[PDB]
Amino acid sequence: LKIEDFELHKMLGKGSFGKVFLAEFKKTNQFFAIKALKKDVVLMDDDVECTMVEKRVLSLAWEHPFLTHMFCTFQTKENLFFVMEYLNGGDLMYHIQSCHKFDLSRATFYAAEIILGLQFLHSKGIVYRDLKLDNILLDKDGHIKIADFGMCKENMLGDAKTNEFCGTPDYIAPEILLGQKYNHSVDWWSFGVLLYEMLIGQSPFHGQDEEELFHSIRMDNPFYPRWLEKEAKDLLVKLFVREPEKRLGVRGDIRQHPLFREINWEELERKEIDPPFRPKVKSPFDCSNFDKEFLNEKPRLSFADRALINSMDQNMFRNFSFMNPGMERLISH
Amino acid sequence: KLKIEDFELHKMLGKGSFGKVFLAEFKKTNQFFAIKALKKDVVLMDDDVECTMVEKRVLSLAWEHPFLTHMFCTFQTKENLFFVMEYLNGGDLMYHIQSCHKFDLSRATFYAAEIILGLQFLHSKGIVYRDLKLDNILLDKDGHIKIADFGMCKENMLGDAKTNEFCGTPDYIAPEILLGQKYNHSVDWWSFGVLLYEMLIGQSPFHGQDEEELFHSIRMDNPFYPRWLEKEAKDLLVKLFVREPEKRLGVRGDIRQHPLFREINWEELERKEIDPPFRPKVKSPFDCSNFDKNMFRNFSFMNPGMERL
Ligand SMILES: Cc1cc2c(cc1NC1CNC1)N1C(=NNC(=O)[C@H]1C)CO2
Ligand SMILES: Cc1cc2c(cc1NC1CNC1)N1C(=NNC(=O)[C@H]1C)CO2
Ligand code: NA
């Protein structure tokens, strides 16, 4: 399989994560989102291990209804490709910029579906570490899909901990900022930050530079407006406990919190509770719910630093190729 | 303490007056770097002992700033001097000027803004740069500028301190240097004017068939500005090409408040939040090859960034 077998119609986004294209396989009317990376960029950014972690985690994640599904991965001399399911609902950052903040029932629904996704990852010994609004995609019906697993730590079951400094600044837990060894607790602090931003429409911690922001994360009390529902406030107070072992998600049973009192968790996992927000989606190949800056730009793969790629060790991305049983059936035919 | 055996020299990127630049990989980590290599006997012949030490001392201070070339570590063998640098494959600005003749106003404004930040950092640290030019500005893979080659710097230039040695690349040298005057950071702002003029117009502001005529033009001729040039770009260049240093913009006034940099948020620029308007298409526009083959005391140094790796 090669990229020439796909027709790259539009570019949905670019950035540090690479380039994401709306791709159609041949002329089968079967659409996909292809994340296309350049090997030389990956090497200079020191994202070799991060790329392999993303492949491995997406190999676990095809079961779970609220993690992004990967159909196949493959590589050329210059390129690394992930062929994903195309989720044209739009990400939560895109939707929250428009409406400023989410209503209580919508934020609760998203919070509940994210809990199922995170608890699945944690059960497999995976700590996610990069939970944020623009890493949560919506599908055509409005169910959440957690995305971007390159920042994960695997093999975290049992009495296991890790210590490396990573994540997005607004969402970084204080235990990471203080240089402590940590476990899945870091995801639940980030979850609280995400939930706060959905409900309140701004971040709970602030600063003019990173130093003030990290001080705020370590020291400052989150602000709860008078209009905020009390059970929403309670959950956030139980999530913003700086002692990791006393934080909800690590301690207690987060599903039994009164915020999710109307939520049947078995029904939610089976996709049987209707999302309070259904995105506008005309077709399976619609591009309405994406920033228009990228869409208008012509889809293309960059050139590569030939001196770097020729001098590179080829076996860095060994065992990168993957393919589920569905893709083999829709290739040979 | 690091050694050359810890690296593996893969391919040669450049060769000339700045020694030889090699693309090198670290032994176990597979982390790629640019290594600049100088022969000691060659450096002693050219009388650039002090120049090499000034480069090391400036590159030690310059690890913090985003638009200066980052040096990870320096070390020496019996015959060679090595600077372990971050690998910057975007290409130098002389290459990109030669590609498209001139940069448009947005591209020229962006590069001019990032150069102002880099220069003003050096000036606040007591470093007058003195060799600003297109081929000493490297781009990273994203498109951000990186000021390189600090061998011609002068240290301890804080407050009313001055120096008097004749130096710089002919097209860019200030009148006060040509007039043999005791000068300060003002010389960088003249050179900035020349570099900015070349980006917008695609030719040098001062001309001559030899140095004698070129230096006369620098001292006497006012530069030509075409009709199509934007009035704000012209205005900044006119204020930059003042021949009395004290009246020059950069020395006098605040260069960041000029109408050319109207849309530029200076803090967001310095944090690298504003994306470059030009990403390089060609990757590593440099000539590539196979590999083949006590005045320098206190040359060894290692930045705390390298200590992590
Ligand atoms: C910008 C962007 C657009 C995308 C998608 C992702 C992004 N950007 C990433 C950065 N965080 C979301 N995806 C989509 N579907 N499925 C996926 O797995 C990914 C490739 C839809 O389009
Ligand atoms: C010709 C040349 C090639 C280079 C580099 C420099 C040059 N030439 C110099 C002359 N002005 C740029 N560098 C690079 N990365 N970082 C650096 O500091 C230097 C060593 C990449 O390759
Ligand atoms: Na504060």
What are the residues whose beta carbons fall under 8 Å from the beta carbon of A236, sequence distance 6 or more? A192, A195, A196, A199, A222, A224
Residue B99, φ and ψ in degrees, nearest 5? -70, -50
What string of DSSP letters covers B249-270?
BTTBS-GGGSGGGSS--HHHHH
For residue B32, give the nearest of A44, A302, A303 by CB distance. Answer: A44
Gyration radius from chain B CA atoms:
20
Nearest chain A Cα distance for residue B284, angstroms: 6
For residue A305, give the nearest of B25, B281, B284 by CB distance. Answer: B284
A14 is in an annotated binding site: yes
Whole-number Å distance, alpha carbon A215 to ligand 3 midpoint, is 7
Q: Closest residue (by CA) to atom 11 of ligand 1? A: A135
Measured N-to-C along each axis, helices B186-201 and B105-124 cross at an angle, to the nearest 10 degrees, of 170
Greatest alpha-carbon pair distance for chain B in Å reads: 58
Residue A304, φ and ψ in degrees, nearest 5? -120, 155
Residue A26 structure tokens: 């041949």
Domain assignment present for residue A329? The answer is: no
Helix (H) or strand (E) holding A147: none
Are residues A210 and A230 both part of a single domain?
A: yes
* CA dist., res. A187 & res. A41, Å (int): 28
What is the extent of the structural domain holding A164? 91-280
* CA dist., res. A199 & res. A232, Å (int): 8
Domain assignment present for residue B306? The answer is: no
Are residues A122 and A136 both part of a single domain?
A: yes
Whole-number Å distance, alpha carbon A247 to ligand 3 midpoint, is 23
Are residues A23 and A150 both part of a single domain?
A: no
- C-alpha to C-alpha distances, B143 to A324, A332, B45, nearest whole angstrom: 38, 42, 37
Are residues A112 and A224 both part of a single domain?
A: yes
Are residues A157 and A298 both part of a single domain?
A: no
Residue A97 structure tokens: 């910029």
- Of the residues B92, B131, B140, B149, only one is catalytic, namely B131
Domain assignment present for residue B267? The answer is: yes
Please report residues of A whose CB lies closer than 8 A to that of B25: 311
Closest CA relative to residue A44, chosen from B143, B87, B66, B272: B87
Residue B77 structure tokens: 């063998």
Domain assignment present for residue A333? The answer is: no
Domain assignment present for residue B307? The answer is: no
Domain count, chain B: 2
Name the residue in chain A with its Cα closest to that of B8: A311
What are the residues whose beta carbons fall under 8 Å from the beta carbon of A223, sequence distance 6 or more? A200, A204
Domain assignment present for residue A164? The answer is: yes
Are residues B86 and B98 both part of a single domain?
A: no
Q: Which residues of B171-180 are buried (b: 16+ CB within 10 A; e: fewer)?
A: bbbbbbbbee
For residue B288, give the nearest of A40, A48, A307 by CB distance. Answer: A307
Question: Do A311 and B141 make contact, defined as CB atoms within 8 angstroms?
Answer: no
Are residues B75 and B103 both part of a single domain?
A: no
CATH number of the CATH domain containing A271: 1.10.510.10
Are residues B179 and B293 both part of a single domain?
A: no
CATH number of the CATH domain containing B74: 3.30.200.20
- Enzyme catalytic residues of A: 130
Are residues A63 and A153 both part of a single domain?
A: no
B19 is in an annotated binding site: yes
Residue B89 structure tokens: 């494959």
Name the residue in chain A with its Cα closest to that of B88: A44
Are residues A165 and A142 both part of a single domain?
A: yes
* CA dist., res. A127 & res. A118, Å (int): 8
Interface test with A, best of B33, B283, B284, B286 (most A CBs within 10 A): B283
Closest CA relative to residue B257, chosen from B113, B142, B128, B151: B113
* CA dist., res. A134 & res. A132, Å (int): 6
Amino acid at A246: K
Q: How many CA atoms lie within 13 A of B154 on its CB side?
A: 20
Domain assignment present for residue A325? The answer is: no
Domain assignment present for residue B308? The answer is: no
- Chain B: residues touching A (Cβ < 8 Å): 10-11, 13, 23, 25, 30-32, 87, 89, 141, 281-284, 286, 288
Whole-number Å distance, alpha carbon A59 to ligand 1 midpoint, is 17
* CA dist., res. A137 & res. A222, Å (int): 26
B30 contacts B21 by C-beta, under 8 angstroms: no
Q: Specify whether B131 is catalytic.
A: yes
